[PDB]
Amino acid sequence: MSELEKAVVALIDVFHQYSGREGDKHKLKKSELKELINNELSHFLEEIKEQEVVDKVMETLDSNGDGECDFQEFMAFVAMITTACHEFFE
Amino acid sequence: MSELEKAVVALIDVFHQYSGREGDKHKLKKSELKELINNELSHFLEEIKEQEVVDKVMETLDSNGDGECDFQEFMAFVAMITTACHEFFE
Ligand SMILES: [Ca+2]
Ligand SMILES: [Ca+2]
Ligand SMILES: [Ca+2]
Ligand SMILES: [Ca+2]
């Protein structure tokens, strides 16, 4: 596997490390999404310590309105983060 | 940096390794896109050896119709690849 291929599988690896914790094992609920951002995005995103912030993140990511973040929705989130880091370095 | 953070920056790293070769340094032209897929996606995508295949890939990725693949368009491509690998493992 190339670096890019490793990065692709890392995205799947990490999503499932969090989505697999509780309930639907293929989607992130609020607490799973919260721990993902807090543990895995600490250098890009501000630590989440408030419920209103958890709710707002979920609302923003949850395109289909089912209260959880699926893999497609997680990818859109990765894209918004990756693009912000990209433009940071212009 | 966490694994997920490393994967985010890998996506930016690799795009620029190819986009920086010729012309517009912030976009992938056909030959750059071709070498990216051929060198960096050899385990996920079939090697590209025909011009009609290069053209078709570019056409599919090039959402804004300017003949090149920018970072946003490259991200949509990463998402389609990552999701295919995700569903492969259901
Ligand atoms: Ca879950
Ligand atoms: Ca959802
Ligand atoms: Ca270029
Ligand atoms: Ca374009």
From Swiss-Prot, chains A, B:
Record-linked SUPFAM superfamilies: EF-hand (SSF47473)
Modification type N-acetylserine: residues: 2
Residues covered by the EF-hand domain: 13-48, 49-84
InterPro entries with a match to the protein in the record: EF-hand-dom_pair, EF_Hand_1_Ca_BS, EF_hand_dom, S100-B, S100/CaBP7/8-like_CS, S100_Ca-bd_sub
Coiled-coil boundaries: none
UniProt keyword Magnesium present: no
GO CC annotation: ciliary basal body; cytoplasm; cytosol; extracellular region; extracellular space; neuronal cell body; nucleoplasm; nucleus
A Pfam family this chain is assigned to: EF-hand_1
Gene Ontology biological process terms from the UniProt entry: adaptive thermogenesis; astrocyte activation; axonogenesis; cell adhesion; learning or memory; memory; negative regulation of monocyte chemotactic protein-1 production; phosphorylation
Sequence positions that bind Ca(2+) 2: 62, 64, 66, 68, 73
GO molecular function: calcium ion binding; calcium-dependent protein binding; kinase inhibitor activity; protein homodimerization activity; RAGE receptor binding; S100 protein binding; tau protein binding; zinc ion binding
Location of the protein in the cell: Cytoplasm; Nucleus; Secreted
Residue positions binding Zn(2+): 16, 26, 86
Residues involved in Ca(2+) 1 binding: 19, 22, 24
Job description of the protein: Small zinc- and- and calcium-binding protein that is highly expressed in astrocytes and constitutes one of the most abundant soluble proteins in brain. Weakly binds calcium but binds zinc very tightly-distinct binding sites with different affinities exist for both ions on each monomer. Physiological concentrations of potassium ion antagonize the binding of both divalent cations, especially affecting high-affinity calcium-binding sites. Acts as a neurotrophic factor that promotes astrocytosis and axonal proliferation.
Subunit structure: Dimer of either two alpha chains, or two beta chains, or one alpha and one beta chain. The S100B dimer binds two molecules of STK38. Interacts with CACYBP in a calcium-dependent manner. Interacts with ATAD3A; this interaction probably occurs in the cytosol prior to ATAD3A mitochondrial targeting. Interacts with S100A6. The S100B dimer interacts with two molecules of CAPZA1. Interacts with AGER. Interacts with PPP5C (via TPR repeats); the interaction is calcium-dependent and modulates PPP5C activity. Interacts with TPPP; this interaction inhibits TPPP dimerization.
Protein name: Protein S100-B
Native source species: Bos taurus (Bovine)
